[PDB]
Amino acid sequence: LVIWINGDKGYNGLAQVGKKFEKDTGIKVTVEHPYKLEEKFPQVAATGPDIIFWAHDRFGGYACSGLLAEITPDKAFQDKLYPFTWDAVRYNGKLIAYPIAVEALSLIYNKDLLPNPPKTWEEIPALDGELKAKGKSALMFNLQEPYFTWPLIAADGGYAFKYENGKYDIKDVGVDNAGAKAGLTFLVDLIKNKHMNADTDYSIAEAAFNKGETAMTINGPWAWSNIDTSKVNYGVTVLPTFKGQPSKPFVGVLSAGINAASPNKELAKEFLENYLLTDEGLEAVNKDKPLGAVALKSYEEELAKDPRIAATMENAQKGEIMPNIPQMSAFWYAVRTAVINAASGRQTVDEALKDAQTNAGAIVTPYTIKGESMDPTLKDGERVAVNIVGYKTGLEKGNVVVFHANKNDDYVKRVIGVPGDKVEYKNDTLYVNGKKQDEPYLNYNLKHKQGDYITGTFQVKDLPNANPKSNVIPKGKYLVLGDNREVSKDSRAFGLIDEDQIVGKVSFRFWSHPQ
């Protein structure tokens, strides 16, 4: 068995459970902690680990992609774990991973620098003034990952996707409401006033707190081990309020999923049910890096005695279980970008969260191209990402669109004219609204043609589904052509397509970008 778990978790402890499994069974267990494993997994899934550990939020995306086996615990095993933990790992009615532990961020503070932690975020600027006077700082935490800034953003009313009547509404995104703006503004104000630095990452903040340089950090239970070693006299407490409102962390359930392509699903099941998820197994991992509030009732009964676990659960209770839906990946990426751009000054808070709002709810789905009509822009076999276009929503000239052509087939072509546009071709020259428009994406085909012209003279008025009296494209209609104009079967053959046929726009990577 190959096992992947994040580098901040107790992977040495997990390896010890692995060694016990090997000693009992002969089956060798290799624990790896790759950089950005949560992103590597989908690439290698069909090659990677037999078991992947991550918080539950990533698993719906994995399952949606067919990368995970349904897990089959019996009633007796299920009863050993808290019911709410099984909720976190259920996607589309099916259990898709084993829950291990509940993780929530807490405020961690140095009792020698700060005997009373601040009740409110608002106090931090003044507190930092005092600490700077002795060459210290009030607060350092990972500004590079939105997980850590989320509690403050959500405090006064930010949310990811609205959960109502048993479902998440991915159209209802709460990334740019007043609460979110207020939280992110406060964060940016901290940075503007030098109470924090925009470049502070996980390792910088951890080193700072563990060396006694900063009075507070924000981190999860896995961080307590290193603090123990550092000998800092620390406390773990409730996050401060913002505008009177508790901070609201997104709560993760560390979970273990089984690769759908693993030839060792039965061995994985044995390892997780009978070695890891036992008092002994969890203790081995916990003693390495603390897990938080474990999913196994019998062991949690011991761990819940710890004041630090009480603080972890208290913060959890103010926050919310992360959604596990496939859209979660897009949400995190959008929020990460917003916080980075706001914190560095590239965008104002309003600009940043406006974009994040759009990006967080934008559905992206894979397609595979088949055929030559878009060559060389898209090639036969090419994998692409398609940004789903909302019903009756912003299609523009130049967008490459996927649309339903008939009951069986989706096609991909380029939008050359939108409703209201007057369009005609004179030879290979495109006229839109009386003005010649350059088509740089045809450059290669224009210069490697068999005939006199690749597109040829035609007018919209002559095409099926057009207004026979005008070159002005009717309401709800689109003119689409394939980039491989000499071979393409497109609007020239089948006429204008309707708005309700359109699925989405193909996203393109531009080859150039700044350094």
């Binding site: 949606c64 595979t368 088949k370 060559d375």
Partner: peptide, 14 residues
């Protein structure tokens, strides 16, 4: 989501 392989977008020739 469904767990199925990615859909196909045809780029049809005449």
């Amino acid at each position: 989501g469904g767990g199925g392989g990615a859909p196909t977008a045809k780029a049809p020739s005449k």
